[PDB]
Structure 1
Amino acid sequence: LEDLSQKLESMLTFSHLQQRSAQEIVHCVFQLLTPMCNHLENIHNYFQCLKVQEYHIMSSCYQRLLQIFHGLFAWSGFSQPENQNLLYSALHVLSSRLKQGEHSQPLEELLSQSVHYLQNFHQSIPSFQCALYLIRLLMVILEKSQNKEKIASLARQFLCRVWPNISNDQLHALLCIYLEHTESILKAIEEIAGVGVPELINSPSSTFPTLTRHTFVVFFRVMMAELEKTVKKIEPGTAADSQQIHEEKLLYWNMAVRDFSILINLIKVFDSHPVLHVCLKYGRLFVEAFLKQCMPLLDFSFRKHREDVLSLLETFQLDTRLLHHLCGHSKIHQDTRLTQHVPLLKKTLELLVCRVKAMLTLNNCREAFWLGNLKNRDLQGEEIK
């Protein structure tokens, strides 16, 4: 199976192989894998429901199998219709791995049967990588259609289990998969950021484990990136759009902003190179999204829905300030690696200021825009001199 996974990886994403077409190889592989490695997969499940070197081997076999399945099912010749008769026979096989009689069945029903079969492995698995392959497999089976909830429950189980080491990138990919399928990204980070704390309270390893003093980094990274990606998707309409839609947009904004505030406040406890490296690199992206896709809405809904906007901006100052402090901190402890990403941040903040000025300028309240220079603090709260 090491050998066969090597060959598929080469072929899709070794000479005697390459003198054949992918279609030929996959066409043969249906007959060369499906019913008889399904037996072997079932046998692994039987074993893993329950000397150590065999266990290591059997885990390796399990991941190699599922890797083969993913390498199979993601073939871009199942996009085109020719290889899809093959897929219909394959699905027939996977469904008939439990139950027979439902012949020439609707495609989607057969998908449900296959994935419902693939559900039952969730507890057997010993290691991370297996889980990941399984999930990626399911997701690429399922896109042939709501169903996110099943992926989400599964991902949450496999983020929440014990996992007796683990490499960061695996987890990165798993949590990307979690968050892009969850209902509410915002309350997800909020839950996880009232839980970034018990890493400090309890264990010098939490109630959401896979969260060592190491692993915080990757959580943070993904929470920042996926949040910034989320809010970028919003389109501000016009005053033709109802106050109602504006209200829910603003609440959405407000939740995202306080989320961001909560994220950034975690820097004082977790000072390092790379956690800083993240908030610098991501903060600017957040703010830019805020400029390009809030400010026009505020221009629209100023004169009616103003007090919300003022609470919003006032709140947003209270981490903007932290970010400026961070820039200063980064300059003082003269760390090349962080300072690289300062000046675009700076430039981005001042541009926020000036955009607000312009925002009032349109609404005929320009003179009210007063400035004040800022006290110089570190991250904790001083007036450093």
Structure 2
Amino acid sequence: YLAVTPDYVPPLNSHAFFRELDIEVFSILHCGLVTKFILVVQLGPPELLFLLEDLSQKLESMLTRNIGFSHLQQRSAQEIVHCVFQLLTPMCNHLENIHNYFQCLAAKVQEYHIMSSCYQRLLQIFHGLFAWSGFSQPENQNLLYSALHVLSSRLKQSQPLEELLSQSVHYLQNFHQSIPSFQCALYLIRLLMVILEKSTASAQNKEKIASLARQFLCRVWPSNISNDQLHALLCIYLEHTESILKAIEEIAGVGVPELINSPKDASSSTFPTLTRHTFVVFFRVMMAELEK
């Protein structure tokens, strides 16, 4: 009925007109997830997306106008992150289940889209949680340690802090294979960087960020990729690679020539994300990075 109704004003931008959900509503995320395809009353894929979308918007409003967030703003950011932290364990479980979901599609369509949105919402929540300016303060480092210990406990369980980061990154990096969309890959990449920021030694940390970034660039993403997101990924790959000059030489000296020889509606073999329509993004990043 919204489609047949262009002009109409709802009685008193969904958050502007819909009632705010309490922060305690997300406590029902402890329910498991079951899908109709390729896997009492239990949480469904559309219901999970509804809860994840609302939680992501709440985090984006404080950690990253007041209409639709009056009750949320009435609690300080310290409690909101702490409240989300209590959701970490049931929320990593949803990520693992969806990760196991996409792996089984190695060998209906609306279900795929809903789970894809759920995957991206989880990573955005995960990234927004750890990438909080409050973690720079020393008072809540214990809270950060507890969050990092949760991820490290998903594989094997007063450990040293650096061990938690290495384990947490290793646990999260395993999700790259299951990622179904470019936006999810960018969210995982950004999530890895903010965690690796806490680690002082980044000689190898830069390479694993760069190696993962190149793999996403070289992957054949099914078709959707926006130039803004592709621009963001190129900056991450170039700023983190060991030799930016050799990286630029490879894209411009190998990737671009084979793009020209390829058909008009085609892409580079080495860089499938490099087509005639996205060349400007590659060119703009390479020139800007070279100048920097």
- What is the TM-score of this pair, normalised by structure 2? 0.76
- Aligned equivalent of 1:24: 79
Alpha-carbon distance, 1:123 to partner: 0.9
Q: Find the partner of 2:268 among 191, 206, 214.
A: 206
Q: Find the partner of 1:5 among 38, 44, 56.
A: 56
| Aligned residue pair count | 225
Whichever residue aligns with residue 199 of structure 1, its letter is L
Could you give the per-residue CA deviations for residues 141-183 of structure 1, whole angstroms, max 9, x where no partner exists?
Answer: 0010121110111001000010011100000000000000001
Q: Which runs of 4+ in 1 moved over 6 A?
A: none
Could you give the per-residue CA deviations for residues 6-31 of structure 1, whole angstroms, max 9, x where no partner exists?
Answer: 11111122100011100011111111
SS of 1:78's partner is helix
Alpha-carbon distance, 1:74 to partner: 0.9
SS of 1:47's partner is helix
| Separation in structure 2 between the aligned mates of residue 226 and residue 141 of structure 1, nearest angstrom | 24
- Aligned equivalent of 2:26: none
| Separation in structure 1 between the aligned mates of residue 288 and residue 141 of structure 2, nearest angstrom | 36
Q: Find the partner of 2:243 among 164, 184, 187.
A: 184
SS of 1:197's partner is helix
| Separation in structure 2 between the aligned mates of residue 94 and residue 38 of structure 1, nearest angstrom | 8
**Bigger Cα Rg:** 1
Question: What percentage of residue pairs aligned between the two structures are identical?
Answer: 88
SS of 2:211's partner is helix
- Aligned equivalent of 1:34: 88
- Aligned equivalent of 2:41: none
| Separation in structure 2 between the aligned mates of residue 99 and residue 41 of structure 1, nearest angstrom | 17
Alpha-carbon distance, 1:211 to partner: 1.0
- What is the TM-score of this pair, normalised by structure 1? 0.58
- Aligned equivalent of 1:370: none
Whichever residue aligns with residue 272 of structure 2, its letter is P
Could you give the per-residue CA deviations for residues 355-374 of structure 1, whole angstroms, max 9, x where no partner exists?
Answer: xxxxxxxxxxxxxxxxxxxx
- Aligned equivalent of 1:149: 207
Alpha-carbon distance, 1:84 to partner: 1.1
| Separation in structure 2 between the aligned mates of residue 191 and residue 97 of structure 1, nearest angstrom | 38
Alpha-carbon distance, 1:73 to partner: 0.6
1:175 aligns with 2:234: yes
- Aligned equivalent of 1:118: 172
- Aligned equivalent of 1:66: 123
| Separation in structure 2 between the aligned mates of residue 185 and residue 88 of structure 1, nearest angstrom | 34
Could you give the per-residue CA deviations for residues 75-128 of structure 1, whole angstroms, max 9, x where no partner exists?
Answer: 11110011111111111111111111xxx1000011000000011111111100
Please report the RMSD computed on the Cα atoms of aligned residues, expressed in angstroms: 0.8
Structure 1: which 5+ runs fail to align? 230-385
Q: Find the partner of 2:141 among 74, 84, 87.
A: 84
1 or 2 for the larger relative contact order (CA 8 Å, sep ≥6)? 2
Structure 2: which 5+ runs fail to align? 1-51
Alpha-carbon distance, 1:62 to partner: 0.4
